[model samples]
Target chain A: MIFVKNLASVLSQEWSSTEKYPGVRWKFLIDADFDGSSGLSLGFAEIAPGGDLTLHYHSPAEIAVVTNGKGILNKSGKLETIKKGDVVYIAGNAEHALKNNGKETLEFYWIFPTDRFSEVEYFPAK
Target chain B: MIFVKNLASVLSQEWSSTEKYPGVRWKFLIDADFDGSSGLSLGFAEIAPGGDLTLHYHSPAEIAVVTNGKGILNKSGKLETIKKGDVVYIAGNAEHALKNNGKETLEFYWIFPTDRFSEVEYFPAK
Candidate 1:
């Protein structure tokens, strides 16, 4: 099935989180709406100023494109500042976290190699 | 391995094409740079005004985000105008073509759910 959608028009939802794992809100542009056999997932995410994603790792690789504002990407033990147009690649099982370091909202487009989000295992970095 | 690169900084290469199939230029952001076992490929493509992607289909599905200017996306038999922030999903093996309908260059971020670019079969729509 083919679909065309404006990223801004899509519904965004707050990510579930616990005290140790603060999360950002996001919109799933391609998920259950598409065939699971497609073997891919795409979405947009936003983090309010000072908000951050808790350290975690995924079993599958992930790629994120910065669309607005700025943020700090902490991959493994290294930290780097990222801004709009920056493409960040996180290798499978590499611990990482993101923080909205800019005054405005930090937004990005994120993609996963897997079709089913549930199939990705998230390991918290402790 | 983790890597960060600017979409604009990546080397762009013109896609090989035949007389009947005009191709656009693109930069592979997550191709040979990352592990093929990751099962994903990401890239940015640019089509100058009046330029178009020859009608074709891929064995694996594709998801593209319009990052600059505007264009017309012909999916299967349906056509739609797309602009920045617009996300387009192309089902596997669905005939599709893209045209830079606007006066300016049309740029987009494209993702494929496959690790090896060579593994994705391309079928030109006759």
Candidate 2:
């Protein structure tokens, strides 16, 4: 077991994102095999203002903490306004989307399980 | 997908922790069933001055961010002092412990997956 004080010291020094979701930016923090764990990944993300994230779902679900700005979260058909100091819980396969409604970019910390089979789907709005 | 701002509005409305680790106090921010997803839990924690958390490991790796104060994290036989702006990744099945080395309570946010089979083991120091 290793306790990392500075996540950057132990994390993969790369910031990337899904091509399908251009509005989202990510900085990978912790990786699964780094500590002999199954699969765990954490990072910081920035969603551009008025930008929208792909509507997706995952098996292990996704957990996030809003650190700055605000956004409109669309779950199924309901719309919820979220701002800084917020925590979001998106269950796997719940059909969710995010759109920054604030004047500035929305920033958050995102966590994901690194299970190889973990899948995310993108559903375009009709 | 429910984006929650003002975490205080939707959290479990209480702060608690395992009796085996009196120094570690927790505020449950999210639970597994909150979004029809598997077992997922997130919270804010406080470790009292000179306090220590029980040595334990869990099935789902725990993710945390140090918000305030400082502590010495013991993983295996290594000791590392952790402070604010630090993100900790604790793999499941890896024995670990935390001790507040600072003058005040160490505060952090912890996230856990709510897999029913998720278990934690306590190993006492000899």
Candidate 3:
């Protein structure tokens, strides 16, 4: 009984930007609040060059699919360069962050094991 | 506590194919069995032109992220055209199918609310 949503619908939504995640913006694509979806939440995030998503941890594990561009993934203290076609799996409560060191906007789709993005609480790493 | 897996690791895995989904093949990217990932299992599925994925249902909700090409999604009796950049949320136990009607192969990433891909049981729709 569900239908498909195209790029236009997601891209048209208001971009979410916070001081904690500078140079980064995102929009939810499938969530209970956004589209009556359950059990999962998906969103597309973009990080412009020099942008950074600071280290943080949530209760639910997540997977990030890099659709375009490149960036650096901070796995605790170890850093690794991630580019297009890479899939990242972050364990729950594992502190991680992403930085766009490349000269292009890094794009990735993040999926969580929750009903909506808001349900997951982000605890900043010290 | 987490790392990235490039496309090579996924592509190097054996492709999964079945008679129920003719002209379609897939490979798992993140799973408890594949990469010790928990909570969610993700894989890439490709449907060749003229291929059809017979209607089926499962207990867990699923999301499909179209990465390339186009196809027709069968929502029970309703038919909807989906293309690149489209995100689809199929409810749990919802009868659905997909057919690649375009000339090129239809590629998409499918995610499920499971610890591993093997935990899901496919119930073919009659």
Specify the highest-TM-score model's number: 3
| Model 2: per-residue Cα lDDT over B1-126, one tens digit each | 554534467464566677788777776566643334454567778899878886777556787777788988887668888887777878767777889978887987777655322233445654
lDDT of 2 by residue, A1-126 (tens): 455645467355555667777777766556543344444566677898767887766555677787779988887778888887778877665677889878888988877655322233345555
Each model's lDDT comes to 0.77, 0.69, 0.89
| lDDT, candidate 2, at A15 | 53
List candidate 2 stretches off by more than 4 Å.
A3-7, A10-12, A33-36, A116-126, B1-7, B10-12, B33-36, B116-126
- Please state the error at residue A14 of candidate 1 in Å: 7.0
- Per lDDT, the best of the predicted structures is 3
- i-RMSD values for every candidate model: 2.0, 2.6, 1.4
With candidate 3 superimposed using the best TM-score fit, by how many Å does residue B52's alpha carbon deviate from the native? 1.1
Let me know the TM-score candidate 2 reaches against the reference structure: 0.79
Q: What digit string (tens of lDDT, one per residue) describes model 3 on residues B1-126?
A: 586876587656888899878999998888888777888888888999999998899999998999999999999889999998888889899999999999988999999989899989999887
Tell me the native contact fraction for each prediction: 0.74, 0.57, 0.90
- Report lDDT (Cα) of residue A13, candidate 1: 51
List TM-scores for all candidates, in order.
0.88, 0.79, 0.96
How far is A84's C-alpha from truth in model 2 (Å)? Answer: 2.8
lDDT of candidate 1 over A13-126, digit per residue (tens): 545345653547766777764334456688778888888987898778888888899988997878988988888878788888999977988989888876756667778896
Q: In candidate 3, what are the lDDT values of residues A1-126, reduced to their tens digit?
A: 566876587655889999999999998888888888899889889999999999999989998989889998999989999998788889899999999999988999999988899999999997
